[PDB]
mmCIF file with all atom_site columns, C-alpha atoms and ligand atoms in Angstrom:
data_model
loop_
_atom_site.group_PDB
_atom_site.id
_atom_site.type_symbol
_atom_site.label_atom_id
_atom_site.label_alt_id
_atom_site.label_comp_id
_atom_site.label_asym_id
_atom_site.label_entity_id
_atom_site.label_seq_id
_atom_site.pdbx_PDB_ins_code
_atom_site.Cartn_x
_atom_site.Cartn_y
_atom_site.Cartn_z
_atom_site.occupancy
_atom_site.B_iso_or_equiv
_atom_site.pdbx_formal_charge
_atom_site.auth_seq_id
_atom_site.auth_comp_id
_atom_site.auth_asym_id
_atom_site.auth_atom_id
_atom_site.pdbx_PDB_model_num
ATOM   1   C CA . UNK A 1 1   ? 2.322   17.359  -6.718  1.00 27.05 ? 1   UNK A CA 1
ATOM   2   C CA . UNK A 1 2   ? 5.221   14.856  -6.526  1.00 28.26 ? 2   UNK A CA 1
ATOM   3   C CA . UNK A 1 3   ? 6.171   13.622  -9.955  1.00 24.47 ? 3   UNK A CA 1
ATOM   4   C CA . UNK A 1 4   ? 6.697   9.830   -9.593  1.00 22.64 ? 4   UNK A CA 1
ATOM   5   C CA . UNK A 1 5   ? 5.314   7.045   -11.954 1.00 19.77 ? 5   UNK A CA 1
ATOM   6   C CA . UNK A 1 6   ? 3.598   4.017   -10.497 1.00 19.58 ? 6   UNK A CA 1
ATOM   7   C CA . UNK A 1 7   ? 5.896   1.078   -10.849 1.00 19.76 ? 7   UNK A CA 1
ATOM   8   C CA . UNK A 1 8   ? 9.103   2.996   -11.217 1.00 20.37 ? 8   UNK A CA 1
ATOM   9   C CA . UNK A 1 9   ? 12.182  0.813   -10.718 1.00 21.43 ? 9   UNK A CA 1
ATOM   10  C CA . UNK A 1 10  ? 13.745  3.076   -8.041  1.00 22.50 ? 10  UNK A CA 1
ATOM   11  C CA . UNK A 1 11  ? 10.483  4.099   -6.308  1.00 19.94 ? 11  UNK A CA 1
ATOM   12  C CA . UNK A 1 12  ? 11.833  3.222   -2.941  1.00 18.66 ? 12  UNK A CA 1
ATOM   13  C CA . UNK A 1 13  ? 14.622  5.630   -3.296  1.00 14.41 ? 13  UNK A CA 1
ATOM   14  C CA . UNK A 1 14  ? 12.371  8.502   -4.408  1.00 10.32 ? 14  UNK A CA 1
ATOM   15  C CA . UNK A 1 15  ? 9.838   8.028   -1.596  1.00 10.67 ? 15  UNK A CA 1
ATOM   16  C CA . UNK A 1 16  ? 12.422  7.656   1.025   1.00 9.61  ? 16  UNK A CA 1
ATOM   17  C CA . UNK A 1 17  ? 12.309  11.541  1.296   1.00 8.88  ? 17  UNK A CA 1
ATOM   18  C CA . UNK A 1 18  ? 8.632   11.836  1.973   1.00 11.15 ? 18  UNK A CA 1
ATOM   19  C CA . UNK A 1 19  ? 6.736   13.023  4.943   1.00 10.73 ? 19  UNK A CA 1
ATOM   20  C CA . UNK A 1 20  ? 2.994   12.637  5.034   1.00 7.48  ? 20  UNK A CA 1
ATOM   21  C CA . UNK A 1 21  ? 2.366   15.848  3.109   1.00 3.64  ? 21  UNK A CA 1
ATOM   22  C CA . UNK A 1 22  ? 4.821   14.987  0.345   1.00 3.20  ? 22  UNK A CA 1
ATOM   23  C CA . UNK A 1 23  ? 3.171   11.525  0.057   1.00 4.10  ? 23  UNK A CA 1
ATOM   24  C CA . UNK A 1 24  ? -0.180  13.231  -0.409  1.00 4.62  ? 24  UNK A CA 1
ATOM   25  C CA . UNK A 1 25  ? 1.280   14.769  -3.666  1.00 5.82  ? 25  UNK A CA 1
ATOM   26  C CA . UNK A 1 26  ? 1.503   11.417  -5.517  1.00 4.33  ? 26  UNK A CA 1
ATOM   27  C CA . UNK A 1 27  ? -0.695  10.448  -8.421  1.00 6.42  ? 27  UNK A CA 1
ATOM   28  C CA . UNK A 1 28  ? -1.362  6.947   -6.927  1.00 5.84  ? 28  UNK A CA 1
ATOM   29  C CA . UNK A 1 29  ? -2.339  5.502   -3.615  1.00 5.85  ? 29  UNK A CA 1
ATOM   30  C CA . UNK A 1 30  ? 0.709   4.842   -1.175  1.00 4.99  ? 30  UNK A CA 1
ATOM   31  C CA . UNK A 1 31  ? 0.622   3.047   2.107   1.00 6.07  ? 31  UNK A CA 1
ATOM   32  C CA . UNK A 1 32  ? 3.678   2.292   4.228   1.00 6.79  ? 32  UNK A CA 1
ATOM   33  C CA . UNK A 1 33  ? 3.436   -0.781  6.490   1.00 4.80  ? 33  UNK A CA 1
ATOM   34  C CA . UNK A 1 34  ? 5.658   -2.112  9.202   1.00 2.92  ? 34  UNK A CA 1
ATOM   35  C CA . UNK A 1 35  ? 6.664   -5.797  9.044   1.00 3.52  ? 35  UNK A CA 1
ATOM   36  C CA . UNK A 1 36  ? 3.514   -6.794  10.994  1.00 3.46  ? 36  UNK A CA 1
ATOM   37  C CA . UNK A 1 37  ? 1.256   -4.854  8.617   1.00 4.48  ? 37  UNK A CA 1
ATOM   38  C CA . UNK A 1 38  ? 0.511   -1.822  10.887  1.00 2.75  ? 38  UNK A CA 1
ATOM   39  C CA . UNK A 1 39  ? -0.074  1.289   8.871   1.00 3.02  ? 39  UNK A CA 1
ATOM   40  C CA . UNK A 1 40  ? 2.620   3.959   9.177   1.00 3.52  ? 40  UNK A CA 1
ATOM   41  C CA . UNK A 1 41  ? 1.630   6.251   6.324   1.00 2.00  ? 41  UNK A CA 1
ATOM   42  C CA . UNK A 1 42  ? -1.586  6.370   4.164   1.00 3.59  ? 42  UNK A CA 1
ATOM   43  C CA . UNK A 1 43  ? -1.847  9.097   1.475   1.00 2.00  ? 43  UNK A CA 1
ATOM   44  C CA . UNK A 1 44  ? -4.715  11.229  0.044   1.00 2.00  ? 44  UNK A CA 1
ATOM   45  C CA . UNK A 1 45  ? -4.850  9.345   -3.218  1.00 2.00  ? 45  UNK A CA 1
ATOM   46  C CA . UNK A 1 46  ? -5.284  6.073   -1.419  1.00 2.00  ? 46  UNK A CA 1
ATOM   47  C CA . UNK A 1 47  ? -8.159  7.519   0.617   1.00 2.00  ? 47  UNK A CA 1
ATOM   48  C CA . UNK A 1 48  ? -9.802  8.738   -2.639  1.00 2.00  ? 48  UNK A CA 1
ATOM   49  C CA . UNK A 1 49  ? -9.598  5.121   -4.011  1.00 2.00  ? 49  UNK A CA 1
ATOM   50  C CA . UNK A 1 50  ? -10.871 3.365   -0.767  1.00 2.00  ? 50  UNK A CA 1
ATOM   51  C CA . UNK A 1 51  ? -12.950 5.840   1.052   1.00 2.00  ? 51  UNK A CA 1
ATOM   52  C CA . UNK A 1 52  ? -10.852 5.512   4.295   1.00 2.00  ? 52  UNK A CA 1
ATOM   53  C CA . UNK A 1 53  ? -9.832  8.649   6.102   1.00 2.73  ? 53  UNK A CA 1
ATOM   54  C CA . UNK A 1 54  ? -5.985  8.468   6.239   1.00 2.00  ? 54  UNK A CA 1
ATOM   55  C CA . UNK A 1 55  ? -5.346  9.755   9.661   1.00 5.74  ? 55  UNK A CA 1
ATOM   56  C CA . UNK A 1 56  ? -7.952  7.407   11.033  1.00 5.08  ? 56  UNK A CA 1
ATOM   57  C CA . UNK A 1 57  ? -6.307  4.281   9.619   1.00 2.80  ? 57  UNK A CA 1
ATOM   58  C CA . UNK A 1 58  ? -2.695  5.091   10.517  1.00 4.98  ? 58  UNK A CA 1
ATOM   59  C CA . UNK A 1 59  ? -1.854  2.761   13.476  1.00 5.99  ? 59  UNK A CA 1
ATOM   60  C CA . UNK A 1 60  ? -4.360  0.077   12.417  1.00 5.97  ? 60  UNK A CA 1
ATOM   61  C CA . UNK A 1 61  ? -3.376  -3.293  11.113  1.00 6.31  ? 61  UNK A CA 1
ATOM   62  C CA . UNK A 1 62  ? -4.055  -3.368  7.392   1.00 7.56  ? 62  UNK A CA 1
ATOM   63  C CA . UNK A 1 63  ? -4.686  -7.204  7.082   1.00 2.00  ? 63  UNK A CA 1
ATOM   64  C CA . UNK A 1 64  ? -6.501  -7.836  10.324  1.00 3.58  ? 64  UNK A CA 1
ATOM   65  C CA . UNK A 1 65  ? -8.761  -4.720  10.495  1.00 3.28  ? 65  UNK A CA 1
ATOM   66  C CA . UNK A 1 66  ? -8.697  -2.374  7.583   1.00 2.00  ? 66  UNK A CA 1
ATOM   67  C CA . UNK A 1 67  ? -8.621  -4.682  4.589   1.00 2.00  ? 67  UNK A CA 1
ATOM   68  C CA . UNK A 1 68  ? -9.753  -8.288  5.424   1.00 2.00  ? 68  UNK A CA 1
ATOM   69  C CA . UNK A 1 69  ? -10.415 -8.973  1.751   1.00 2.00  ? 69  UNK A CA 1
ATOM   70  C CA . UNK A 1 70  ? -6.628  -8.815  1.313   1.00 3.17  ? 70  UNK A CA 1
ATOM   71  C CA . UNK A 1 71  ? -6.038  -11.451 4.091   1.00 4.47  ? 71  UNK A CA 1
ATOM   72  C CA . UNK A 1 72  ? -5.421  -14.217 1.546   1.00 2.84  ? 72  UNK A CA 1
ATOM   73  C CA . UNK A 1 73  ? -2.463  -16.063 0.008   1.00 2.14  ? 73  UNK A CA 1
ATOM   74  C CA . UNK A 1 74  ? -2.764  -13.720 -3.005  1.00 2.00  ? 74  UNK A CA 1
ATOM   75  C CA . UNK A 1 75  ? -2.053  -10.506 -1.096  1.00 2.00  ? 75  UNK A CA 1
ATOM   76  C CA . UNK A 1 76  ? -1.229  -10.931 2.629   1.00 2.00  ? 76  UNK A CA 1
ATOM   77  C CA . UNK A 1 77  ? 0.558   -14.196 1.828   1.00 4.01  ? 77  UNK A CA 1
ATOM   78  C CA . UNK A 1 78  ? 2.913   -12.336 -0.538  1.00 2.00  ? 78  UNK A CA 1
ATOM   79  C CA . UNK A 1 79  ? 3.414   -9.564  1.982   1.00 4.20  ? 79  UNK A CA 1
ATOM   80  C CA . UNK A 1 80  ? 4.342   -11.902 4.873   1.00 4.47  ? 80  UNK A CA 1
ATOM   81  C CA . UNK A 1 81  ? 6.602   -13.983 2.661   1.00 6.62  ? 81  UNK A CA 1
ATOM   82  C CA . UNK A 1 82  ? 8.438   -10.754 1.624   1.00 9.99  ? 82  UNK A CA 1
ATOM   83  C CA . UNK A 1 83  ? 8.733   -9.584  5.288   1.00 8.76  ? 83  UNK A CA 1
ATOM   84  C CA . UNK A 1 84  ? 10.050  -12.918 6.261   1.00 6.14  ? 84  UNK A CA 1
ATOM   85  C CA . UNK A 1 85  ? 12.698  -12.997 3.444   1.00 5.88  ? 85  UNK A CA 1
ATOM   86  C CA . UNK A 1 86  ? 13.532  -9.264  3.817   1.00 7.45  ? 86  UNK A CA 1
ATOM   87  C CA . UNK A 1 87  ? 12.856  -8.532  0.173   1.00 2.44  ? 87  UNK A CA 1
ATOM   88  C CA . UNK A 1 88  ? 9.588   -7.867  -1.700  1.00 2.90  ? 88  UNK A CA 1
ATOM   89  C CA . UNK A 1 89  ? 8.748   -6.526  -5.179  1.00 3.24  ? 89  UNK A CA 1
ATOM   90  C CA . UNK A 1 90  ? 5.548   -7.691  -6.725  1.00 4.81  ? 90  UNK A CA 1
ATOM   91  C CA . UNK A 1 91  ? 2.758   -6.250  -8.840  1.00 2.00  ? 91  UNK A CA 1
ATOM   92  C CA . UNK A 1 92  ? -0.696  -7.766  -9.313  1.00 2.02  ? 92  UNK A CA 1
ATOM   93  C CA . UNK A 1 93  ? -4.318  -6.751  -9.855  1.00 3.07  ? 93  UNK A CA 1
ATOM   94  C CA . UNK A 1 94  ? -6.836  -7.175  -6.952  1.00 4.92  ? 94  UNK A CA 1
ATOM   95  C CA . UNK A 1 95  ? -10.457 -6.264  -6.103  1.00 7.93  ? 95  UNK A CA 1
ATOM   96  C CA . UNK A 1 96  ? -11.158 -4.260  -2.879  1.00 3.25  ? 96  UNK A CA 1
ATOM   97  C CA . UNK A 1 97  ? -14.743 -5.054  -1.702  1.00 4.17  ? 97  UNK A CA 1
ATOM   98  C CA . UNK A 1 98  ? -14.916 -4.619  2.031   1.00 7.17  ? 98  UNK A CA 1
ATOM   99  C CA . UNK A 1 99  ? -17.716 -2.161  2.978   1.00 7.02  ? 99  UNK A CA 1
ATOM   100 C CA . UNK A 1 100 ? -17.249 -0.380  -0.351  1.00 3.30  ? 100 UNK A CA 1
ATOM   101 C CA . UNK A 1 101 ? -18.218 -0.610  -4.010  1.00 5.25  ? 101 UNK A CA 1
ATOM   102 C CA . UNK A 1 102 ? -16.033 -3.369  -5.412  1.00 7.39  ? 102 UNK A CA 1
ATOM   103 C CA . UNK A 1 103 ? -13.057 -1.615  -7.017  1.00 5.28  ? 103 UNK A CA 1
ATOM   104 C CA . UNK A 1 104 ? -10.438 -3.224  -9.236  1.00 4.73  ? 104 UNK A CA 1
ATOM   105 C CA . UNK A 1 105 ? -6.937  -2.007  -8.795  1.00 4.20  ? 105 UNK A CA 1
ATOM   106 C CA . UNK A 1 106 ? -3.254  -2.666  -9.587  1.00 6.25  ? 106 UNK A CA 1
ATOM   107 C CA . UNK A 1 107 ? -1.113  -3.259  -6.467  1.00 6.49  ? 107 UNK A CA 1
ATOM   108 C CA . UNK A 1 108 ? 2.558   -2.907  -6.238  1.00 4.15  ? 108 UNK A CA 1
ATOM   109 C CA . UNK A 1 109 ? 4.277   -3.961  -3.026  1.00 3.54  ? 109 UNK A CA 1
ATOM   110 C CA . UNK A 1 110 ? 7.903   -3.131  -2.589  1.00 5.34  ? 110 UNK A CA 1
ATOM   111 C CA . UNK A 1 111 ? 10.192  -3.212  0.500   1.00 4.82  ? 111 UNK A CA 1
ATOM   112 C CA . UNK A 1 112 ? 11.246  0.299   1.547   1.00 2.40  ? 112 UNK A CA 1
ATOM   113 C CA . UNK A 1 113 ? 14.944  1.156   1.105   1.00 2.00  ? 113 UNK A CA 1
ATOM   114 C CA . UNK A 1 114 ? 16.015  1.520   4.702   1.00 2.00  ? 114 UNK A CA 1
ATOM   115 C CA . UNK A 1 115 ? 15.024  -0.232  7.976   1.00 2.00  ? 115 UNK A CA 1
ATOM   116 C CA . UNK A 1 116 ? 12.271  -2.913  7.689   1.00 2.00  ? 116 UNK A CA 1
ATOM   117 C CA . UNK A 1 117 ? 9.112   -1.366  6.218   1.00 2.00  ? 117 UNK A CA 1
ATOM   118 C CA . UNK A 1 118 ? 7.079   -2.110  3.145   1.00 2.00  ? 118 UNK A CA 1
ATOM   119 C CA . UNK A 1 119 ? 5.193   -0.027  0.628   1.00 2.00  ? 119 UNK A CA 1
ATOM   120 C CA . UNK A 1 120 ? 1.764   -0.834  -0.887  1.00 2.00  ? 120 UNK A CA 1
ATOM   121 C CA . UNK A 1 121 ? 1.109   1.361   -3.925  1.00 2.00  ? 121 UNK A CA 1
ATOM   122 C CA . UNK A 1 122 ? -2.348  1.241   -5.600  1.00 2.00  ? 122 UNK A CA 1
ATOM   123 C CA . UNK A 1 123 ? -3.967  2.709   -8.748  1.00 2.00  ? 123 UNK A CA 1
ATOM   124 C CA . UNK A 1 124 ? -7.234  2.106   -10.468 1.00 2.00  ? 124 UNK A CA 1
ATOM   125 C CA . UNK A 1 125 ? -7.598  -0.179  -13.500 1.00 2.00  ? 125 UNK A CA 1
HETATM 126 C C1 . HC4 B 2 .   ? -10.477 -5.437  1.310   1.00 2.00  ? 1   HC4 B C1 1
HETATM 127 O O1 . HC4 B 2 .   ? -10.971 -5.743  2.377   1.00 2.00  ? 1   HC4 B O1 1
HETATM 128 C C2 . HC4 B 2 .   ? -9.857  -4.268  0.885   1.00 2.00  ? 1   HC4 B C2 1
HETATM 129 C C3 . HC4 B 2 .   ? -9.915  -3.183  1.717   1.00 2.00  ? 1   HC4 B C3 1
HETATM 130 C C4 . HC4 B 2 .   ? -9.088  -2.006  1.536   1.00 2.00  ? 1   HC4 B C4 1
HETATM 131 C C5 . HC4 B 2 .   ? -7.983  -1.911  0.693   1.00 2.00  ? 1   HC4 B C5 1
HETATM 132 C C6 . HC4 B 2 .   ? -7.071  -0.888  0.787   1.00 2.00  ? 1   HC4 B C6 1
HETATM 133 C C7 . HC4 B 2 .   ? -7.212  0.165   1.714   1.00 2.00  ? 1   HC4 B C7 1
HETATM 134 O O2 . HC4 B 2 .   ? -6.378  1.169   1.716   1.00 2.00  ? 1   HC4 B O2 1
HETATM 135 C C8 . HC4 B 2 .   ? -8.337  0.136   2.493   1.00 2.00  ? 1   HC4 B C8 1
HETATM 136 C C9 . HC4 B 2 .   ? -9.259  -1.013  2.545   1.00 2.00  ? 1   HC4 B C9 1
#
């Protein structure tokens, strides 16, 4: 288990060290996206929240294919503004309801420390 709190101020520094197995040790869902929204990493906690099988969604586009209910100004619009700006740090509640029981969550999106990739962190509320 990786001991990291959801919403921590320096979360991007702490998760910069994590391979897929380490990410699977977190208490919350974690997705790493490229600037187009393609999934680079998707952890076990996230799959428990959403029902998706992690290795099956890596490589898919989060907004176009996996999570169309997030293709909205309230989620994807924030993401793409942050990619365009090169800076992103926002936390909001959302409901995931595509081919699943509607599930209310808290989402924290934050630009990764290095390069140009973006974290999406999720926990139940
Ligand atoms: C709405 O379509 C939400 C879907 C969803 C959210 C998060 C995931 O990791 C997978 C699917």
